[PDB]
């Protein structure tokens, strides 16, 4: 899709193998934010939004928090506290055609700067600065969209760069998306490191005597300590009390 009305997929309820991406040499920029590139396969994510657009080559630096520019303000704005990773690679031989390519267009004039993650399909003509324009482009009201016109003879800064941005928040369970890991058997009554669906901690696990409501993925005691969790494999409720410690 073009940079206006960028395609968004809501990736959820699957195991995500990130190892095929961050070790793949096909990508030009793999600048992640708020997460290490090599730790992506070892984490569980609440919801993963995958965006996709094609932009001009010199404009790939604008897709980053806090930047400014036409793409950054009128087409696609990342928030100031963005977490995720931005993936881009050159696509001059797939997105550009001989004599030109015109399926890719970008918004050039807008009355106001976009909110983060906003999407503006509105092709209504630009503000006049004068008497308003009924429906006709000209002299005050311009067409807000504009095609790059990608050509194979253009420089690397003008070549069509195909960009994918993965936006995803990393709270605890219920994590719909997590990386690949061999789930193993349950070890009760021992001081055991656990990774329950993204909920990570160290403690002993006891068969719980408390009754969860059928929606609660885990529980907490007073002062926000995670006292209980339900098993993602067999739906048993397990109490987590800390491993025994004390001064000697």
């Amino acid at each position, epitope marked *: 899709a073009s940079v206006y009305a960028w395609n968004r997929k809501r990736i959820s309820n699957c195991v995500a193998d990130y190892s095929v991406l961050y070790n793949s040499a096909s990508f030009s920029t793999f600048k992640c934010y708020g997460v290490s590139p090599t730790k992506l396969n070892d984490l569980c994510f609440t919801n993963v939004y995958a965006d996709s657009f094609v932009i001009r080559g010199d404009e790939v630096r604008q897709i980053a928090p806090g930047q400014t520019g036409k793409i950054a303000d009128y087409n696609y704005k990342l928030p100031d506290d963005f977490t995720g990773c931005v993936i881009a690679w050159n696509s001059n031989n797939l997105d550009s055609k001989v004599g030109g390519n015109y399926n890719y267009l970008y918004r050039l004039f807008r009355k106001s700067n976009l909110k983060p993650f906003e999407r503006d399909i509105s092709t209504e003509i630009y503000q006049a600065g004068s008497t308003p324009c009924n429906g006709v*482009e000209g002299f005050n009201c311009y067409f807000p969209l504009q095609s790059y016109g990608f050509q194979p003879t253009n420089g690397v800064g003008y070549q069509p760069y195909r960009v994918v941005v993965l936006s995803f928040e990393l709270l605890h369970a219920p994590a719909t998306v997590c990386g690949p890991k061999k789930s193993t058997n349950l070890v009760k009554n021992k001081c055991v490191n656990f990774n329950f669906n993204g909920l990570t901690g160290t403690g002993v696990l006891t068969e719980s005597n408390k009754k969860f409501l059928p929606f609660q993925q885990f529980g907490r005691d007073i002062a926000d300590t995670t006292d209980a969790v339900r098993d993602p494999q067999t739906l048993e409720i397990l109490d987590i009390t800390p491993c025994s410690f004390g001064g000697v």
Partner: antibody
Amino acid sequence: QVQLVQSGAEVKKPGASVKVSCKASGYTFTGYYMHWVRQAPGQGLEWMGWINPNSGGTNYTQMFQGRVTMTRDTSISTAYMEVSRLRSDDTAVYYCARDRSWAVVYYYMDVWGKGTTVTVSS
Amino acid sequence: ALTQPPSASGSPGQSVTISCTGTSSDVGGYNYVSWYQQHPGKAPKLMIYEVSKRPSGVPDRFSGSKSGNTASLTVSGLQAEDEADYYCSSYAGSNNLVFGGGTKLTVL
């Protein structure tokens, strides 16, 4: 090289139709608007209308609205101007022109084609 | 249409002018006055795109500026290169653009 290649000349019967084509080259076809202006062989120069290759929005002058239409062809990087009834007042050389401005519809005509001559017969 | 004087005269190395009698009610209000230099038999080119601004490649010896309702383009130190028709144009208030009649530069 930003010269626009206009089509060849044509001769048409009175009252009949005719279409003229100007092919872009060098510059980015989408963007820069394309205005159509006519010059009678005796005198003067008159403006008909423009189509933008960016969006295909058209405007026309009042003297030609409802009797002459325009269209674009981004596949061949060319824009067409169509005349429905070749009246004997319209036997003239028709010129296509770019605009200086990037993507706004102003009127700053820089580079002009060689011009396809049109003739009304008898 | 635009009223316009038909001709101007001179000799190579002199200074002469050509004027454009537009109406201040409709023509001069939205200014944007563009002048074009047209030899016979060939396409013209813009010679002052705004009311006073030359395009790239235009010699500096050509000058112009609106003055009240009328607009004028002047040629200083001309030669055989400047024997051409000259046309006035403007916005005319809405998308219906208008041109002038077209004065003719002449050198004795």
